[PDB]
């Protein structure tokens, strides 16, 4: 297909985020390189007005599924890829148990040769010592599930999953995330039948970085299909 055609190859990512959780604004960018061919991710984030008000692996998922490997079989189902490069709009809320939320908005597209994921955070009802502004998650990431269906009516997706973010005491602080993407463009998009992006995440650091920052390794597969 035509949005499949631009993702053979390795392709360079931007990503842009403003964020404000309980009146703490902050912002994050991000650097680095996409092959959808091998389901592959890598990428730098910076916090760029200083220290991080929330913890990284909070914003793992705000911070361009178009990159999933979709295996040949299933590409017939592969939304992300089918809207570009004119692109989509990704909403969520993630509900933090027994914490606040983020709501967020992104527009991902291609601006020439690269793919760039913009995005508005908002959090709110977050307690202030709780596991989220309390600074309490283990800097480490989950292997996930990602549900996906069709949603018709907006000519776009539903998406629903959770995240199990390791909290430093041996716990478990569950992040319920509802999400829909609709394509920018008037073009004909790939509705997808039901299946689900298996997902996994690797956090490091850079060791010559002084500012607040995530270095991320992430591989994902379409499954559930056959």
């Not at 979709?70 to 027994?98: C, L, N, W």
């Not at 994921?117 to 600074?135: A, C, Q």
């Not at 009516?153 to 995330?177: C, M, T």
């Amino acid at each position: 297909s035509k949005g499949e055609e631009l993702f053979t190859g390795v392709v360079p990512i931007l990503v842009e985020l403003d964020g404000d959780v309980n009146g703490h604004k902050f912002s994050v960018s991000g650097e680095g390189e996409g092959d959808a061919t091998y389901g592959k991710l890598t990428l730098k984030f910076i916090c760029t007005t200083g220290k991080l008000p929330v913890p990284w692996p909070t914003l793992v998922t705000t911070l361009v599924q178009c990159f999933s490997r979709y295996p040949d079989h299933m590409k017939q189902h592969d939304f992300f890829k089918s809207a570009m490069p004119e692109g989509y709009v990704q909403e969520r809320t993630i509900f933090f148990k027994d914490d606040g939320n983020y709501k967020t908005r992104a527009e991902v597209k291609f601006e020439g040769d690269t793919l760039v994921n913009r995005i508005e955070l908002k959090g709110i009802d977050f307690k202030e010592d709780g596991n989220i502004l309390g600074h309490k998650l283990e800097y480490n990431y989950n292997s996930h599930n990602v549900y996906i269906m069709a949603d018709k009516q907006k000519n776009g997706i539903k998406v629903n999953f959770k995240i199990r973010h390791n909290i430093e005491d041996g716990s478990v602080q569950l992040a319920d995330h509802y999400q829909q993407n609709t394509p920018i463009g008037d073009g004909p998009v790939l509705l997808p039948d039901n299946h689900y992006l298996s997902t996994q995440s690797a956090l490091s650091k850079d060791p010559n970085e002084k500012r607040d920052h995530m270095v991320l390794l992430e591989f994902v597969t379409a499954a559930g299909i056959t």
